[PDB]
Amino acid sequence: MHLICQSGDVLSARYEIVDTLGEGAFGKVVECIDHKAGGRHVAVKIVKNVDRYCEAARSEIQVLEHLNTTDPNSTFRCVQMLEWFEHHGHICIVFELLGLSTYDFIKENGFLPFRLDHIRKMAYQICKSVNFLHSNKLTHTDLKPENILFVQSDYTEAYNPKIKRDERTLINPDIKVVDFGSATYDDEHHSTLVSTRHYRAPEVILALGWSQPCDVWSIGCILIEYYLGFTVFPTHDSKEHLAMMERILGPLPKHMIQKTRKRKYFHHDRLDWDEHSSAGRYVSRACKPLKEFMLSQDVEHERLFDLIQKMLEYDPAKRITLREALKHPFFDLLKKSI
Numbered sequence: 001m002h003l004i005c006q007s008g009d010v011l012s013a014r015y016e017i018v019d020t021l022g023e024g025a026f027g028k029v030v031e032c033i034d035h036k037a038g039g040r041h042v043a044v045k046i047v048k049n050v051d052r053y054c055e056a057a058r059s060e061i062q063v064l065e066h067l068n069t070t071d072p073n074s075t076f077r078c079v080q081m082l083e084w085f086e087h088h089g090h091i092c093i094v095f096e097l098l099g100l101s102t103y104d105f106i107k108e109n110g111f112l113p114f115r116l117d118h119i120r121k122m123a124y125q126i127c128k129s130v131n132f133l134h135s136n137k138l139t140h141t142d143l144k145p146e147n148i149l150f151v152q153s154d155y156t157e158a159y160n161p162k163i164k165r166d167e168r169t170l171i172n173p174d175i176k177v178v179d180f181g182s183a184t185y186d187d188e189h190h191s192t193l194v195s196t197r198h199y200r201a202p203e204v205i206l207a208l209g210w211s212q213p214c215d216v217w218s219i220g221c222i223l224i225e226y227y228l229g230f231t232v233f234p235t236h237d238s239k240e241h242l243a244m245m246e247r248i249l250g251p252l253p254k255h256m257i258q259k260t261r262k263r264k265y266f267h268h269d270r271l272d273w274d275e276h277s278s279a280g281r282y283v284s285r286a287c288k289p290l291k292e293f294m295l296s297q298d299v300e301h302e303r304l305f306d307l308i309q310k311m312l313e314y315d316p317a318k319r320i321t322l323r324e325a326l327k328h329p330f331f332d333l334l335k336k337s338i
């Protein structure tokens with residue numbers, strides 16, 4: 001793919017690459033000048049020339065055709081696909097150019113969190129956008145800060161010599177949801193593994209089956225990450241992941257522990273985890289009950305955390321819906337009209 005995506009390369013006799021926006025395992029996203037739409041800047045995802053990413057981009061194109069047609073004004077904040085083409089046997093998908101991923105925005109400010117006012121606006125929009133997928137018999141499955149992007153370059157940035165980086169200050173926090181290559185329809189076959197490990201629901205970890213509620217878990221993890229500036233589940237390993245959930249959210253429902261065929265992780269009805277090993281005293285030291293991450297006892301911080309705690313309900317049958325979520329008191333402040 002190195003061979004086909006340099007600056008100055010022209011795709012489909014119109015898209016001139018000017019910059020790289022994002023890399024990763026699926027392939028590359030590049031900024032292009034569209035010489036056939038009056039020099040409008042767009043994004044083109046170049047898909048890695050492999051079975052996996054080919055069929056996932058074929059599916060993504062089908063999903064976007066449906067979302068974009070159903071919601072032409074993008075009221076529900078899903079990215080607009082403009083077209084797709086083939087370039088040296090890679091699928092390329094053209095998109096409206098958005099601003100920074102929320103991931104890159106936090107990362108490049110030294111992992112400093114978003115303001116509560118911004119998080120309220122962003123959480124509302126994420127919940128409204130993914131509730132639209134929910135309404136339309138879809139689950140995203142891979143919600144994570146890399147897949148939430150600012151609509152606009154609506155920030156200022158200044159070089160701060162004291163700390164030798166640009167700091168970027170958000171003016172307007174409006175977002176859209178991207179990447180529908182994993183999005184699964186209610187009646188389609190359901191992959192065993194889904195989500196980036198840090199945002200993966202407990203029912204996905206435990207192979208108990210999944211649908212719309214696994215997205216709600218992911219959003220929960222996103223929101224605390226926006227509030228703190230870092231993931232509360234940093235780990236690579238599922239048993240440590242489950243130890244961290246226990247430390248932060250309490251014990252897992254016995255029914256989930258006893259039902260799972262991933263019995264590898266467990267011993268009788270307990271997590272099989274030496275709490276007193278140096279790896280367990282790590283998790284203990286690293287993790288505290290969820291409500292202790294609060295930076296303020298201020299009621300608006302209490303509203304957010306009550307929502308976050310509902311999103312991280314272990315039992316996906318009991319987990320809050322985005323329908324209910326949009327009605328949570330954390331959002332009331334958005335609906336002020338006196």
Ligand SMILES: Nc1c2ccncc2cc2cnc(NCCCN3CCOCC3)nc12
Binds near residue numbers: 022024096098147180
């Ligand atoms: N980075 C993207 C844009 C940047 C600017 N404007 C429009 C964009 C549209 C995109 C549409 N799709 C994707 N990515 C698909 C999945 C990539 N994610 C998940 C993996 O980590 C990287 C981000 N990225 C996109």
